Design a protein around this ligand. Structure first.
Ligand SMILES: [Mg+2]
Ligand SMILES: [Mg+2]
Ligand SMILES: [Mg+2]
Ligand SMILES: [Mg+2]
Ligand SMILES: [Mg+2]
Ligand SMILES: [Mg+2]
Ligand SMILES: [Mg+2]
Ligand SMILES: [Mg+2]
Ligand SMILES: [Mg+2]
Ligand SMILES: [Mg+2]
Ligand SMILES: [Mg+2]
Ligand SMILES: [Mg+2]
Ligand SMILES: [Mg+2]
Ligand SMILES: [Mg+2]
Ligand SMILES: [Mg+2]
Ligand SMILES: [Mg+2]
Ligand SMILES: [Mg+2]
Ligand SMILES: [Mg+2]
Ligand SMILES: [Mg+2]
Ligand SMILES: [Mg+2]
Ligand SMILES: [Mg+2]
Ligand SMILES: [Mg+2]
Ligand SMILES: [Mg+2]
Ligand SMILES: [Mg+2]
Ligand SMILES: [Mg+2]
Ligand SMILES: [Mg+2]
Ligand SMILES: [Mg+2]
Ligand SMILES: [Mg+2]
Ligand SMILES: [Mg+2]
Ligand SMILES: [Mg+2]
Ligand SMILES: [Mg+2]
Ligand SMILES: [Mg+2]
Ligand SMILES: [Mg+2]
Ligand SMILES: [Mg+2]
Ligand SMILES: [Mg+2]
Ligand SMILES: [Mg+2]
Ligand SMILES: [Mg+2]
Ligand SMILES: [Mg+2]
Ligand SMILES: [Mg+2]
Ligand SMILES: [Mg+2]
Ligand SMILES: [Mg+2]
Ligand SMILES: [Mg+2]
Ligand SMILES: [Mg+2]
Ligand SMILES: [Mg+2]
Ligand SMILES: [Mg+2]
Ligand SMILES: [Mg+2]
Ligand SMILES: [Mg+2]
Ligand SMILES: [Mg+2]
Ligand SMILES: [Mg+2]
Ligand SMILES: [Mg+2]
Ligand SMILES: [Mg+2]
Ligand SMILES: [Mg+2]
Ligand SMILES: [Mg+2]
Ligand SMILES: [Mg+2]
Ligand SMILES: [Mg+2]
Ligand SMILES: [Mg+2]
Ligand SMILES: [Mg+2]
Ligand SMILES: [Mg+2]
Ligand SMILES: [Mg+2]
Ligand SMILES: [Mg+2]
Ligand SMILES: [Mg+2]
Ligand SMILES: [Mg+2]
Ligand SMILES: [Mg+2]
Ligand SMILES: [Mg+2]
Ligand SMILES: [Mg+2]
Ligand SMILES: [Mg+2]
Ligand SMILES: [Mg+2]
Ligand SMILES: [Mg+2]
Ligand SMILES: [Mg+2]
Lengths: 62, 207, 143, 122
RNA sequence: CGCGGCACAUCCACCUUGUGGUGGGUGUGGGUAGGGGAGCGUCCCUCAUUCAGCGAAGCCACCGGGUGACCGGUGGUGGA
RNA sequence: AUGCCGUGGUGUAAAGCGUGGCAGUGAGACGGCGGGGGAUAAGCUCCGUACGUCGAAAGGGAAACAGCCCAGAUCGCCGGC
RNA sequence: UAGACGGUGAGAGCCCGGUACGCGAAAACCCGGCACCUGCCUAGUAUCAAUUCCCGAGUAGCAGCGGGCCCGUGGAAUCCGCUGUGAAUCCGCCGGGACCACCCGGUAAGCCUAAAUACUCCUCGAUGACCGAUAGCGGAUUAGUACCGUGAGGGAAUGGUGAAAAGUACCCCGGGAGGGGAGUGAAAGAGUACCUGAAACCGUGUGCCUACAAUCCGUCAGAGCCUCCUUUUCCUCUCCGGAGGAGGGUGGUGAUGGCGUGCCUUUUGAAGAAUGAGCCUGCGAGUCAGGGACAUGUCGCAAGGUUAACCCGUGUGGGGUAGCCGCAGCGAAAGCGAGUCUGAAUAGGGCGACCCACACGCGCAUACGCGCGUGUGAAUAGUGGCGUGUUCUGGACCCGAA
């Protein structure tokens, strides 16, 4: 039986050209009036997955 | 590199050149071992079977009450710890055969035949029996003249029925077609005996 | 020769671990030890003890996927130069035969590496740098 | 293939039962009880092989003390005097001498007494 | 600490001077959960070889052996 | 006073750091010192302590006596300190 | 052309049934062929005309409520059901994922249709790195039997003398049962309680110890007895053999001295007065599947590696390029590409490519390199198979509820 991948994990993670796994950052969907532009700029963009969670994230993605 | 072609109840009548790329390949023991193992694995039937606790006859109801008895609770009478109960992790029908790549298979066969040729255990003959009537006596005499060892492999064309039947029932003689050569049979054989047409067909097939 | 002479390469075959067979090996708990969930079952990978998991507390990657995207099989002028030091007309089937590109696919030429041979290559959708390098070397880049 | 356990399984049973001969009760008859007694027996033997060195030294010291006090000196001062005289005769051989050659033991006592200092309390 | 046997690691020189062996120093060798390494014994198949109604297997006794799981020899019973 | 951060020397094989495979553990106990709760009682309860032992540590001492004192068992010896 | 298998007083190609190979069917049935027989064909072909008719109805469409499609009602197309309303016949109608226009495709609401696919109560012929009497079917034995239940149902246990009954004539003790002597048999150390014949368990004989002692039953120290062998001096009968004397060593026993809180599980901690175990023999728990996922060892080929289905072969062999992975990345995407995205930015950032232990010419600095042309040759790389560890979906290490 073919292995199945996790749907939410595939929707929330992706790999780069050399094999790193990147993600987007939370706290940036609503309630933006009180957040300074410095905070929102920090939350903007993509970032790599922590070395503590990389094993579980890899297992989810595979 | 050059073997002599012999005739039954006769003498030499030709010579056949063995190309180096087919009969001079170095012997790779590990590769030959892997290919031979895969062959013997594919040769298995794998028709063993047992019954699990779900497949043993009966055993549906809970035999008695859990509490107030003074005995172990049992759940079913076909639990594996019971006599006559099911088998745990027992044999089931299996398919033993591996996916050995063609390059490895061919390399192992070529190495086996190279070993045979290098040691000088390859013989070529025109035919096994003069006429169209098989004769095990004359065939056995011819092979005894050619060689004296217990195991012999005979490679003859699929259309040479008289030669096939003449050596069919000789002990220690194995027969196969040119396109069915393989490492296990070649390595089991002490000597390899080729018909001229079979040798040419094999060489032409392998270019 | 002689099937009783074949042996496997060293280190290719190791004995399996049989895990419930006494005290001199993985003893009785068979490497589990515990008394909890892991003593009898597996814990699902998605489970994090009850707090919102990593794959649920993080946002979905933004965007969409193009249903009609066209993909090209690319090759660099450096590769072309290495494969065809003699120059001459070069086509998609020649690229496939030389094995620098997949078959039954659109071919796009990119401009990485250096090119000295004069080649009149034909493909789809050249790059600007590749076109410049082709015309500088003296060949032609046609779709 | 199905393998019957009996041929392999009886070897350790035979060895344990042969080793447990001479025990009384279940301990020489049943394999399960002979196994526990074998565990205890071998632990006891290991412990006692180390302890018997101390026990034999104790016996030698007692016999040497008896001989010394027979020759009117304490074990204390006899050992101290032999060390002073530089005699490195063993305690085992000292006890053997005490039992076998009393004249030799007496000579050793005089040697140790001479080697002792003039006042042992200074 | 003394004398003798074993093992692991490291260092020093030889042998194919790391696949590993030869000799010599130095350190180390309690151990549950657990991790790594290497082995004993039972059965079946294949290849080679060898024993067997002048007695196989199995069982029983005795005498020995190995660092362990365990092994060998001799006799008795037995009958493939 | 200690403890903590950095730095220059000296010493020390089985320290440390990175990245992978495979874990177990996440009920601790008593003792010393510093505290809270309690009545400054508890073989009470909760914290700290490059503090110890037990857990997972046999041997000698404390009459007996997981947790106290000494001391960490490769094997043999009818040797010594 | 026969060395398959089995039997026969122990391993048989030449002893037997057989095997290779070759012959064989009254009749019946199946299949095929030929006739009889049956039925169809008995002028319409093309051209033109574009005026008319027909082209499957309570159907399609539409609305409501549902079902099902990757699609959980959603912007929801296509398909199916009930309710209501309800068309047109080619200038018709339906489809191409709401819908509209254009274009493309097709011709619903009638019916039939081989082969490639699925299965084995059953009948022949084979096979097994399957079981071998607690196994394998519940069932080698009277087996769905005995037995249990009102019933639906549940559901066992029990194989082996010997080559051949040659199955012990006869005599004796005995009511018999049973035994002894004879006898058969290679063997009764095969006697219808029968091949081999283990352990628990129960006797009989015998060596040692034990009735003033407080014992996890052992261990270390240790006298004394008993037994069997050897070195001495003695019976020198001595070819003896050894009584006997001493010594030494085997083996059995163990007066007496010290030390010593059973095993497992679970626990901070149990000899524990916490759990479990009367005893022996047999059985009883990390397995298998998948071109699954991750990591490793090893092997083949290598910028390539590899086939799936399937085809052909007595096989494990030969074909088979569809596909998969590698071969360039960045971006939500259009797209661009060794760069790309954000951005006004040729700013900075993120991700991705890019080598130097070096030389030579170029500008370079005292040197060190900074990009280029080559070597002083600066080293990459994947992929397929097979082992091992872990993991996924499966009953998934085994056992256990209400
Ligand atoms: Mg938003
Ligand atoms: Mg803002
Ligand atoms: Mg059932
Ligand atoms: Mg149930
Ligand atoms: Mg049954
Ligand atoms: Mg069964
Ligand atoms: Mg193939
Ligand atoms: Mg246990
Ligand atoms: Mg583990
Ligand atoms: Mg746990
Ligand atoms: Mg716990
Ligand atoms: Mg447990
Ligand atoms: Mg799941
Ligand atoms: Mg919550
Ligand atoms: Mg005794
Ligand atoms: Mg000591
Ligand atoms: Mg130590
Ligand atoms: Mg250790
Ligand atoms: Mg362990
Ligand atoms: Mg005989
Ligand atoms: Mg056997
Ligand atoms: Mg025997
Ligand atoms: Mg502080
Ligand atoms: Mg680690
Ligand atoms: Mg907790
Ligand atoms: Mg806690
Ligand atoms: Mg305090
Ligand atoms: Mg307090
Ligand atoms: Mg407390
Ligand atoms: Mg404390
Ligand atoms: Mg614990
Ligand atoms: Mg202690
Ligand atoms: Mg410690
Ligand atoms: Mg102590
Ligand atoms: Mg002293
Ligand atoms: Mg036969
Ligand atoms: Mg119609
Ligand atoms: Mg509708
Ligand atoms: Mg629906
Ligand atoms: Mg819908
Ligand atoms: Mg309608
Ligand atoms: Mg559309
Ligand atoms: Mg139909
Ligand atoms: Mg059909
Ligand atoms: Mg049965
Ligand atoms: Mg039996
Ligand atoms: Mg009835
Ligand atoms: Mg007779
Ligand atoms: Mg007999
Ligand atoms: Mg018999
Ligand atoms: Mg009986
Ligand atoms: Mg019998
Ligand atoms: Mg008395
Ligand atoms: Mg007392
Ligand atoms: Mg005692
Ligand atoms: Mg005591
Ligand atoms: Mg408790
Ligand atoms: Mg108890
Ligand atoms: Mg008790
Ligand atoms: Mg208790
Ligand atoms: Mg309890
Ligand atoms: Mg209780
Ligand atoms: Mg009980
Ligand atoms: Mg396997
Ligand atoms: Mg590999
Ligand atoms: Mg992308
Ligand atoms: Mg922005
Ligand atoms: Mg940039
Ligand atoms: Mg490789």
């Amino acid at each position: 039986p073919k292995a199945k991948t996790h749907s939410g994990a595939s929707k929330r993670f992706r790999r780069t050209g050399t094999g790193k796994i990147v993600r987007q950052k939370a706290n940036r969907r609503h309630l933006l009036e009180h957040k300074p532009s410095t905070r929102t700029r920090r939350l903007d963009g993509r970032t790599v997955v922590a070395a503590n969670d990389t094993k579980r994230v890899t297992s989810l993605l595979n | 590199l050059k073997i002599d072609v012999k005739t039954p109840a006769g003498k030499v009548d030709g010579a056949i050149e063995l190309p180096a790329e087919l009969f001079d390949v170095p012997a790779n023991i590990a590769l030959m071992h892997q290919v031979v193992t895969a062959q013997r694995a594919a040769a298995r039937q794998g028709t063993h079977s047992t019954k699990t606790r779900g497949e043993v006859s009966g055993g549906g109801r809970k035999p008695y009450r859990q509490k107030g008895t003074g005995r172990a609770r049992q759940g079913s009478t076909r639990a594996p710890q019971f006599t006559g109960g099911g088998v745990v992790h027992g044999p089931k029908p299996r398919d033993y055969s591996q996916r050995t790549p063609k390059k490895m298979i061919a390399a192992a066969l070529r190495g086996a035949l190279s070993d045979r040729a290098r040691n000088g255990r390859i013989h070529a003959i025109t035919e096994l029996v003069e006429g169209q009537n098989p004769s095990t006596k004359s065939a056995r005499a011819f092979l005894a003249s050619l060689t004296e060892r217990k195991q012999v492999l005979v490679v003859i064309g699929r259309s040479d029925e008289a030669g096939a039947k003449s050596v069919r029932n000789l002990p220690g003689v194995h027969i196969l077609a040119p396109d069915q050569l393989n490492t296990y049979d070649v390595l089991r054989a002490d000597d390899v005996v080729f018909s001229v047409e079979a040798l040419n067909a094999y060489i032409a097939a392998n270019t | 020769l002689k099937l009783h002479d074949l042996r496997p390469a060293r280190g290719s075959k190791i004995a399996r671990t049989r895990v419930g067979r006494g005290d001199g090996s993985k003893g009785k708990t068979a490497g589990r030890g515990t008394k909890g969930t892991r003593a009898r079952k597996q814990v699902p990978v998605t489970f994090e003890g009850g707090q919102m998991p990593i794959h649920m507390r993080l946002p979905k990657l933004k965007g969409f996927r193009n249903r009609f995207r066209t993909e090209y099989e690319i090759v660099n002028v450096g590769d072309i130069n290495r494969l065809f030091p003699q120059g001459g007309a070069v086509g998609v089937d020649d690229l496939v035969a030389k094995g620098a590109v997949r078959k039954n696919a659109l071919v796009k030429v990119l401009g990485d590496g250096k090119l000295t041979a004069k080649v009149d290559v034909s493909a789809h959708k050249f790059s600007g740098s590749a076109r410049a390098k082709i015309t500088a070397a003296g060949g032609s880049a046609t779709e | 293939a199905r393998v019957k356990r009996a041929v392999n399984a009886h070897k350790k049973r035979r060895s344990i039962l042969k080793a447990s001969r001479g025990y009384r009760g279940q301990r020489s008859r049943l394999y399960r009880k002979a196994k526990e007694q074998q565990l205890h027996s071998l632990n006891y033997a290991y412990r006692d092989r180390r302890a018997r060195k101390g026990e034999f030294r104790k016996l030698w010291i007692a016999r040497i003390n008896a001989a010394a006090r027979l020759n009117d000196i304490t074990y204390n001062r006899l050992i101290q005097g032999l060390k002073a005289a530089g005699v490195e005769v063993d305690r085992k051989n000292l006890a053997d001498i005490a039992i076998s050659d009393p004249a030799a033991f007496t000579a050793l006592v005089d040697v140790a007494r001479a080697a002792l200092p003039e006042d042992v309390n200074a």
